[PDB]
Subunit: 494 residues, 4 copies
């Protein structure tokens, strides 16, 4: 069932969302928003700056004050509001998926069946945690009653990437709100639109004003304002490792706000000679090519044992040669455009090093079409470890395939990167599955699969791929602040 | 390193232990204690009855009173006392292992290297939980502050089996004391001695009087007194499923005391054709023959895929034919006696059905020696499911080996019992390991091993093999009683 | 907002619910169901017996089989089904509240505003736990990978009381289903009707057939069948302590099925001289008189410090003299009838001992009306501890008020009962609040309030008031069965 | 019992500790270490630099490698090593307390009875967690088996302050080692000595080489090397908020290493008119004057309700006038010196603003003695909020006392700081205790006490007083790195 919108899409929500009302930018300036597939302007959106971030934080700060409706309402009712928001997003599933496909260059079937289903499901998961966040009672030494409160932190700045605008909006706001925080959200400059629609739905659902504020605009302007703000308690960011470093620096120099980062990767797969070959090819393929290669977990280094390497490469190239490039919205189309020019350029430049540095180009290797930021799906075999394409996150439809003979050595190669977001292990051997996945320095390790993400699981990076975890029981910790209360008593009893 | 006691062992502690002092039985009666390997009396021990159980409970009840030293001491200090007790048992390791070997018919190497090492390690594990037992603070609906206390339950009656007297004493008292309970312990009539020594060490370590009381004697007398007592809050029992039913009945009819039971099993292994054959033979063998077959987890039904069945049986019989029967204390001896006549008889009677009902007797099948309750190690192949030896817990050195062709069907056969304590799965296939172990109705499932027990793991039965779990984080729950405290407040804030 | 049903109520659902279809009793026999307020027959309902319990268990057993839709569906989808069921009950709130009021003699405002709101809220709470039930990974000694599964137990027999038919149905089925169990439910003989409606809604919501089965009928027939059944894994019961003992006995004698009991109480309040007097009077009053005194937590012994005792009694009597007895359905009416004749009789007989044994009767003390099981609200002062009304659970609108001078002594009196479900402490002193609530042998202790129950809190009894806890995080444990899986590995790494 | 060392103390350990051997600095340079009470050189210690930090990290990195003894040993054995280390520190309690008193200017009774008792107890607490750190098994959507490993992070850089050298060494190394990390420790330049002794005891206890490495030297040299190091996974620091900001900046700019900070405070107490006056005076006094005022939790703003303010100040001044200044080692002496000149100067300069800005000087207000960094205990009343002494952390023996009439307003004043480490609330009113402690933006809130710290409790700051928590169950999270493993399976069952 892939249903579509009967009527053409209208853009309605284009303004800054503060205290559940729509504001013009303080400057009165606006910025254009484009369709990556056509390069055509879709609309203009109010451009947020430091000055508008300041109005947004004051609102969030006020909504967080002791005695406010958001602080005093039952935790179960915070949960209710989140499940209501999920019902509303479900109601507008067609609209939101179309806007996502059109604004983000995302295949409509994926937008409809995966992104929107993931938004709704993650929101419902998070709603369920709200009244299940608990502290402890603790048998402290001495005559004292000690307990802990796992309080909300406060005003959380949240910077959302362009690759999954809806899903990452919900990954951020779901846990933050479930825990009782207020938020100031900065959607990606490329993709502000679906966040602004969701904001209209946060108002409709009845969240108190100031609990969620959305400020579109640029990273170097509105993003830096958030990251350096003296009354924002925490920043959450997903994006490049480079910008990740700036945020952590800015937090340190400003007010020591808490920081969680989900950054890039150069995620490896190790395919043992005993693996289900077809299964490893299929998962490794979709693992690196999903959403035009624009996933932080891109399986961008595939290590295959020598005796099956040739056969793996062949089957891989075959699968890569089956795509149909075009408008995300057209049925049958199986690959959309890259998000924008900056990205488009870096990917072509990286594809060019592949050749110069002397990888074996099996298919693809250039642009496609007359308009839109389309890159041909590309496969390099015989890649080696000092090559740019083997070290640098491409964030493009470009697969690297290498050979290995020694398991000891391939694990060292797999781990020999500053990244560490994810990895895959393909084998039928129980002992190898357990021991290899233990030895990989990666936040998520898939065995005989790839790219399996769900709300029930914590997700995040080792090393420079990130700090902290999102989702699962564990992810919920990073939106709480623990307070210990210790009360003098005449005499304790166990 | 198997060191031994330089001097002959002296029996010192033979009396009822209450309030850290030694008491004669109220009747003044005594009962004999024997060496299973010689049938010779070792000593006389004071015989505990209802009347002595009553003195023991009053002491435990008094030691549990609000404001007592055990109730008011720091949880960390309960932990200290437990780690001290472990240091003391370590000091007397040679003595205790010898007494265990001599009184329980247990091989000295196993007693020294396994039982005593397990006592010490489990005690130290439990000591570490004492100040880490925590309640919660809870975001209740309405204007209320709600917290929970995970209190000790109170006076816990604990009936210890004869097969692992020291280890099961520590399994019971470690968690109970760690949580702040007081205990009345009833060691097995066959094996009171090592418990009485440990009691001398509980006094030495400085536990407050009445926190641990030990009352030797019989099950139908002192056991029934415990199980029916109106001021005992909980009963823990390990033993036969038959007696297990009586305890639960008696608890219901008396004061609805809490009940945890660890009972027998008829635990199955499923060996797939792809398994490491030598490894499965070795683990399945030791799995059923450990401590003269006298383990509740005895791997007493081994299902082997047809194409490796003949080879499995052969290798099995070979291993079973390597034992040396004799005095547990003599070095080189690899199989001791059964614990007593009642047991000895049931095992021979079950071995006799094996033959009549028409299993293939591969080796063993009768008694051994002139004195001592020695049974030849016995192996039956071609066993089928309606046979007594395939349905009834033997608790003797008797292995059953069956064949299967269908995985669906063998799992149904594996699950077709009222027992469910443990199982083993031998295979190299990842999917099968996970899916079979999920489908088995067994409390502990070993994959490519058997009989792996540690303090960090919860342990207990599905179905009529028991109620509740011992050890691990989870086992600690069954020695707490949760109290919710809900306080009216003017206004709550998250 | 107390809205009502525009149209008269029609009874539709009156049959045994198995595999999502309606069955006649195997006997073909039926039993009458009455209105306690009129003594008039409301309808006939199919009478369930052992034979119909057997059909119900086979269905539940089949729905629990490995590979079934209930076993294999995502945990998140079990949660979805539960939130859907809550939406449906919300839709039929008017209908269900009317049926509850009419069948159970329950005040309609309470039924509508409290019982139904509690059903919906508890169901939504439970839905949220479904995909948050987690086992552990454990750092076992040796070279092993060990994890635990917190599996559903299996087929759970659930016996629901008549005092809160809807709320207790949801307390039982919510957690059981959330955890993945299947259930066979036995609603109270007096109050089968609202359960049968909910069953129609379980079918509508799309639970797989056999996941919930409802079998109305009698306790000594269908109840005993459940409690003694050889293929029911667990029994949950709420009711009298007397019947509680029978169930635990029957479980022991049959198949050692797991047992949780929530039984009566004789719950005490301790009111210190420093307490907010009006607040303690109001909470203690509603604490004992709620739902015609028919709560297990009835605050049926109120201990008041001497210097405020006279003033407490006066204010109490005044509040008790304000009721309006009548049909639960009529607006303005503030006290309905007792549930039936058996109950009615025991309450009058207990009121009669109050007089003979020589308490001071302040108001009430006899029946009311010409039809219906109405008892005048009754207040006894100068009650002492050996009086029947001070020892026996009345389960009627009868308040006992006593005096105390010594805090040490009143706590001993408060604790001097075989019951221990709940207690109240009224004081402004921080130290006293904490120390008294610690010293009370009661499962829930309210401070400066009473009768505050919410889904987020575990609830259950100390002593003969019950075994186990319901609701909260902790209550969810008693619907899981823990399985430890231990896998041999070549080498572990931390 | 305050026992002392019979023999004079000898300094033995003065070198850099790497791979359980003693190294000279790579430069060959050394730095002097002083006695704050005499200003006399105690000894010379090897001066660590970037170059020696590099040798220390390579050792820690090697000791962390997959397959090493520290990675492969049982978690229970990591615990054993920690309990052994605690036994050793207990053995050398006299020695270590003397060295602490002499090197750190710390009163010997406090060093012996508090610091050393806290070291031993915290170590034993941490040992107990080692084999109780557990991941989860998770009911992920789809046909997958998902589990998590809570792995050690890796090489942890740990910078220890001078105010509690032993206690903070154990706060850092206890949890880090318990979790399986390796460490590179940088003791304070002022106080390297007791860490070097503990290192000799880490070698004696048998930790594997490279698991703990200690590198003395300066903050701007060895500290910055740690904070900017490209192969250190995490930095933990306790100290000034100013240096705290530099570390977080340096971590961001280098390798995005994880950061936990425990920084200063300007911690407030709120004393209600209903409080136990003597109790609040005593706790607030010791709260600000403990260890010459050199605690991060110094109760450095005491807000007292107007009607008891005069009486509070009087009683306070009286208590402050009872000290005896002198050598920490001399019995009877009740106040030692400040740690050094830099500190001494800042404190006198802050005392000088107190006067100029116009607080009421009640006692003290200048230096003391001819040698040693002694400051007279100082009390300022009538302090207001814009005063330096009311905004700036003094870290000296200087108490500020203010008045308030409005509870709303005093809470705003209490919260009106960038700090937020701790607070105190003194009252007898239950509701106020709960509501005020909820409203305070402080990591630890004491009610009717102050400065109550124990291993069982998490401890750390809100706002610029720190990021993260140390100790308790919760603190253990910040020394783990969570890895999710998701395995494809044919079919899952709940
Ligand atoms: C190859 C191989 O197979 C084996 C099979 C085993 O089978 C067992 O039953 C046991 C005893 C387990 C135990 O500790 N118990 C006391 C606690 C309750 C259960 C019994 C051991 C130690 C065991 C060891 C090995 C080795 C080595
Ligand atoms: C001032 C004041 O006193 C009160 C006293 C009360 O006493 C009760 O017993 C109850 C019923 C609690 C309940 O939900 N039950 C169903 C679940 C099992 C236990 C019974 C309520 C709602 C209650 C409310 C108030 C208010 C308001
Ligand atoms: Cl906590
Ligand atoms: Cl709890
Ligand atoms: Cl578990
Ligand atoms: Cl986790
Ligand atoms: Yb172009
Ligand atoms: Yb004989
Ligand atoms: Yb009548
Ligand atoms: Yb000087």
């Amino acid at each position: 069932d892939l249903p579509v919108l009967l009527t053409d899409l209208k853009i309605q929500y284009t303004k800054i969302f503060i205290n559940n009302e729509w504001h013009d930018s303080v400057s009165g300036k606006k910025f254009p928003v484009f369709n990556p597939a056509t390069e055509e302007e879709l609309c203009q959106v109010e451009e947020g700056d430091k000055e508008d971030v300041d109005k947004a934080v004051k609102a969030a700060r006020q909504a967080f004050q002791i005695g406010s409706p958001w602080r005093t309402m039952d935790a179960s009712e915070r949960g209710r509001l989140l499940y209501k928001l999920a019902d509303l997003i479900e109601r507008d599933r067609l609209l939101l998926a179309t806007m996502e496909s059109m604004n983000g260059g995302k295949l409509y079937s994926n937008a409809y069946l995966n992104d929107l289903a993931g938004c709704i499901k993650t929101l419902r998961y998070c709603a369920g945690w709200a009244d299940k966040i608990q502290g402890r009672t603790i048998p402290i030494d001495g005559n004292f009653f000690t307990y802990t409160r796992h309080e909300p932190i406060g005003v959380c700045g949240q910077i959302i990437p362009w690759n999954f605008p809806l899903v990452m909006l919900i990954w951020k706001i779901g846990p933050a709100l479930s825990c009782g925080n207020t938020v100031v959200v900065k959607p990606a400059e490329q993709t502000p639109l679906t966040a602004l629609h969701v904001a209209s739905l946060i108002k409709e659902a009845g969240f108190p004003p100031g609990v969620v504020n959305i400020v579109p605009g640029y990273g170097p302007t509105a993003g830096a304002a958030i990251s350096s703000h003296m009354d924002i308690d925490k920043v959450a960011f997903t994006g490049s490792t480079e910008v990740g470093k700036l945020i952590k620096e800015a937090a340190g120099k400003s007010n020591l706000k808490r920081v969680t980062l989900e950054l890039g990767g150069k995620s490896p797969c190790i395919v043992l000679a005993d693996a289900d070959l077809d299964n490893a090819v299929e998962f490794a393929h979709h693992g690196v090519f999903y959403h035009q290669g624009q996933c932080c977990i891109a399986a961008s280094r595939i290590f295959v044992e020598e005796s099956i390497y040739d056969e793996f490469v062949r089957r891989s190239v075959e699968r890569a040669k089956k795509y149909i490039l075009g408008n995300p919205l057209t049925p049958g189309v199986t690959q959309g455009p890259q998000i924008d020019k900056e990205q488009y350029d870096k990917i072509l430049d990286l594809i060019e090093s592949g050749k110069k540095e002397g990888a074996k180009l099996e298919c693809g290797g250039g642009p496609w079409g007359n308009k839109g930021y389309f890159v041909q799906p590309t496969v390099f075999s015989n890649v080696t470890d000092e090559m740019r394409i083997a070290k640098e996150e491409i964030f493009g439809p470009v697969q690297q395939i290498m050979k290995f003979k020694s398991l000891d050595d391939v694990i060292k190669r797999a781990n020999n990167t500053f990244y560490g977001l994810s990895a895959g292990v393909f084998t039928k051997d129980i002992d190898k599955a357990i021991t290899i996945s233990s030895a990989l320095q990666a936040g998520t390790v898939w065995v005989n699969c790839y790219g399996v993400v769900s709300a029930q699981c914590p997700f995040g990076g080792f090393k420079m791929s990130g700090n902290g975890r999102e989702l699962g029981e564990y992810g919920f910790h990073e939106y709480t602040e623990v307070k210990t209360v210790t009360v003098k008593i005449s005499q304790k009893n166990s």
